[PDB]
Design a protein around this nucleic acid. Structure first.
Ligand SMILES: [Ca+2]
Ligand SMILES: [Ca+2]
Ligand SMILES: [Zn+2]
Lengths: 608, 320
DNA sequence: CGGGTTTTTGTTAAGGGCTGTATCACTGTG
DNA sequence: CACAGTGATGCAAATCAAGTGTGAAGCCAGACAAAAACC
DNA sequence: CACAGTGATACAGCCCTTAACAAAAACCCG
DNA sequence: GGTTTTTGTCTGGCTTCACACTTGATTTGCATCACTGTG
């Protein structure tokens, strides 16, 4: 420090005389300017920015909220985040990040059960307490040895608490949309909130060791998401929000996670009864909730579309899954559905199923088994979950693709001229189809058909590679035209706004359906005389009616629930306690934090 | 910026003309020194220390080696790290984490193919080049229509280069170990290194779509660890480094990953023949590597203990 | 009210170097 | 006797906020005066 | 038309030097 | 020995950081708990 003043003695004299005569007298400031210029000339902008920050207000230190947002969105676990924080602190000095306890404190705002709320009509059969978090999903069911045995582990949020947590996480988006609609800001009209309920049971989950019941190796998830929010203004309502990616994993919100069989109706109803009770209680009430310092009222419209075909059969009351009554929207037998193929109508509802169960149970007409089933249209059980008539786009596509796979497998063998075939012949057809599919479009053979397989197989090159193994030409042209019909059909029930991006396709859907149905009935009498798949029935009969009734098909699909199922395994394996009694609670909390949107805008701060 | 440059149009001129005379023309260093003296005259010592740390990359920065260590050992993917870096940029304003290209530039030092190594005597059937990286495990196996069909994918490392990289990753560890037992620091005695090579196949690895042969859904890994390293001192021997966790996942350094079948024998032999040839060649050779300013020689002793019984039988003659 | 003076900011093109983003064929939960 | 997690809980250790008067340290002024590596 | 990755690679953006000139904003005084 | 560099000091005056005491009031660190995953 001392031995370097005698090179600078002969320079500081002119430095400070220049500072006096031109700048005013400051020397540290002028040297700061000179050093910034030199650093930027040397291409050391990182050091220049560091010096600018240190000389200006120190911005060191991240907020606990943004630290939590990083920890949750970057797919990190608590131990890894702790070691990252430890090494960053130990190396940098100053504490850039925030500690785990501070992050855990800061995450109670987003979780349900910390904000006050009330219902203007006091909700029936549910408490008005506003400090409920993760409550047991068993709903205090009797676990005594004398009672019906229990084998389910369920951890659950209260429905209204989850809804209010989600809504005031949605708060700032709601306010921004209200501003963007050129409306006021402090208006407090009767908000209408549209939510989507999606339920699906998984498989192959590995049961853990430890104390607990004889829990099965199957899981069922119950999740919901907020699609639309509207408020009344004069004679019309304004779209205050619209979900941009309704099928993503960032919108579905975990609500009730249980480890039970999908088809085990006893425990399924035992755990899902409180949810239906809450839905019924709050379907006819009004919520008062402060929103940015001004109270605002909330109405709720409830729709269930995220149910698979099997689950709809199980919870809506149809016979088992196969039956002779195939559709969950219209009461038509399989043979009648096989002969008409065009004209139908949506005529099933939850109340209709309840009254049909009442008729089936009481038998008001003193009639036998077959005629009673004919009268009740296949309803042989009492429903317990209200679901609206809709179509699951993903499973519809998977089923259609599997059916087309089997059609190709048959056509590469020319069954129309060989009505009788042997198992060896069918095996050889499958083998050659798999080999040539691999060679041409490069898809490996799979036993359970995915959706990516569906998307890749639903191409024109597919029928090309198939028809280069079919000796005849009539089959070539028939498959080509049927493939074109399917490709013209698919966009309608897979797009978020069918009335916007596919107007011509939506308009021509009906004519394409008629052409498809008659093409099947004429050129494919060896597969569809007296039998047709329920998915073909749905696609050819009910899609335009559902479009007209709802507004979009596919935005209500189970794509988001499948993505949530994908996230569930990752959370169970890396972001949850590995004990049979706390794993489900930890998974629920972490999944809620991940699906929270207040923690998502922080990672998109680069566009700000 | 333009106004500051125009006002300061001459100051740069005389400071650079003085730097050309007093020092040689290093304007940045003299300007930093003058700023430090100005701060001292203004009596800020902690600020000067912080500026010195910044110039040395200690007060902030998080050098790319440190960032790469964070990303790798935190099990973070490249896209997630980019997201974290971008959001920290946007919020804090500084550059706490280094960019992905800087991480990739610092990546090449640890990977094989960056250090120079010379053999004496030269390895039989092994090239003397010192920049071989990730080579095809098939070793140029004939894949035309006229010969034996190949249905495997294999990327492998040359055994000697991989050993060189493994030894260089523990340069500081070897120096510390030699310091611990009160030996010298520039001692260049012939090191005796023992390596445990372990090969075990796997099952239920999902085959992917895409261009390639009809690859079976089985994967076979080949890996090695550095158990202990010894130097010859006086009449006896002394250990320098001993792995405290021999069975940990942090020491099983991979060598050759082929997505082939363990039961299949022809493909297994075809893919694993080059590695066995290199090992046999190195069984009687001396490796020379510039270990921290002093050249030191190496010796290799190999023990194949990490095989299960079925593979041991399937390899070493025994049936079923 | 407007020249006149002084100061602020940008512009033209040839090269070098750091930083940010699009592109490629795929993944998974079904 | 595999080993790195897996996150919530709880107690112990560390740091600090409140009050003003001290000490202790670094540096400024321009000038004078000894050690040390190449001829 | 599912949607968020997944990583290596290459091209575009932004900014620094040279130096002379040009467009534009703030006071002074006839 | 010459030459240049490198440290050392000189006293009065200035600023700048640490602490001397006490009592709480937080924030932060790390061990514990029964488990997983790859065979
Ligand atoms: Ca499912
Ligand atoms: Ca094994
Ligand atoms: Zn129907």
């Amino acid at each position: 420090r001392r031995a370097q003043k005698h090179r600078l003695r002969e320079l500081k004299i002119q430095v400070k005389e220049f500072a006096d005569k031109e700048e005013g007298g400051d020397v540290k400031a002028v040297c700061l300017t000179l050093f910034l210029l030199a650093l930027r000339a040397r291409n050391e902008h990182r050091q220049a920015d560091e010096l600018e920050a240190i000389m200006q207000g120190r911005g060191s230190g991240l907020q606990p909220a943004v630290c939590l947002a990083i920890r949750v969105n970057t797919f990190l676990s608590c131990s890894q985040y702790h070691k990252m924080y430890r090494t960053v602190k130990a190396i940098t000095g100053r504490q850039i990040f925030q500690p785990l306890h501070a992050l855990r404190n800061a995450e109670k705002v987003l979780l349900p059960g910390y904000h006050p709320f009330e219902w203007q009509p006091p909700l029936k059969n549910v408490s008005s307490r506003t400090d409920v978090g993760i409550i047991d999903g068993l709903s205090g069911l009797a676990s005594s040895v004398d009672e019906y045995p229990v084998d389910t582990i369920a951890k659950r949020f209260r429905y209204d608490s989850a809804l209010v947590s989600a809504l005031m996480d949605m708060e700032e988006d709601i306010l921004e949309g209200m501003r963007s609609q050129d409306l006021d800001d402090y208006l407090n009209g009767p908000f209408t909130v549209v939510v989507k309920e999606s339920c699906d049971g998984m498989g192959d989950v590995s049961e853990k060791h430890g104390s607990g019941p004889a829990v099965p190796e199957k899981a069922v998830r119950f999740s919901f998401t907020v699609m639309r929010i509207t408020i009344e203004h004069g004679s019309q309502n304004v779209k205050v929000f619209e979900e941009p990616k309704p099928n993503s994993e960032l919108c579905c919100k975990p609500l009730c996670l249980m480890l039970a069989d999908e088809s085990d109706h006893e425990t399924l109803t035992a755990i899902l009864s409180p949810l239906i009770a809450e839905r019924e209680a709050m379907k006819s009430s009004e919520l008062t909730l402060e929103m940015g310092g001004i109270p605002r009222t909330f109405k709720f419209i409830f729709r269930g579309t995220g149910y698979d075909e099997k689950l709809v059969r199980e919870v809506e009351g149809l016979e088992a899954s196969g039956s002779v009554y195939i559709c969950t929207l219209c009461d038509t037998t399989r043979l009648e559905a096989s002969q008409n193929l065009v004209f139908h109508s949506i005529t099933r509802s939850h109340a209709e199923n309840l009254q049909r169960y009442e008729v089936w149970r009481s038998n008001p007409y003193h009639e036998s088994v077959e005629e009673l089933r004919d009268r009740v249209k296949g309803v042989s059980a009492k429903p317990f979950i209200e679901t609206v008539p809709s179509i699951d786009a993903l499973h519809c596509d998977i089923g259609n693709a599997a059916e087309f796979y089997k059609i190709f497998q048959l056509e590469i063998g020319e069954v129309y001229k060989h009505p009788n075939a042997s198992k060896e012949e069918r095996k050889r057809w499958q083998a050659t189809l798999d080999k040539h599919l691999r060679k041409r479009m490069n898809l490996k053979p799979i036993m359970r058909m995915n959706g990516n397989f569906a998307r890749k197989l639903m191409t024109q090159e597919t029928v090309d590679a198939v028809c280069e193994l079919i000796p005849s030409e009539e089959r070539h042209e028939a498959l080509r035209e049927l493939m074109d019909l399917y490709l013209k059909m698919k966009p309608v029930w897979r797009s978020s706004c069918p009335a916007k991006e596919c107007p011509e396709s939506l308009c021509q859907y009906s004519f394409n359906s008629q052409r498809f149905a008659e093409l099947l009935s004429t050129k494919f009498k060896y597969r569809y005389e007296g039998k047709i798949t329920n998915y073909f029935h749905k696609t050819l009969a009910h899609v335009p009616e559902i479009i007209e009734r709802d507004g979009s098909i596919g935005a209500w699909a189970s794509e988001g629930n499948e993505s949530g199922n994908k996230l569930f395994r990752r959370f169970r394996k890396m972001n949850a306690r590995q004990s049979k009694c706390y794993e489900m609670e930890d998974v629920l909390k972490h999944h809620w934090l991940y699906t929270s949107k207040y923690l998502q805008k922080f990672m998109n701060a680069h566009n700000a």
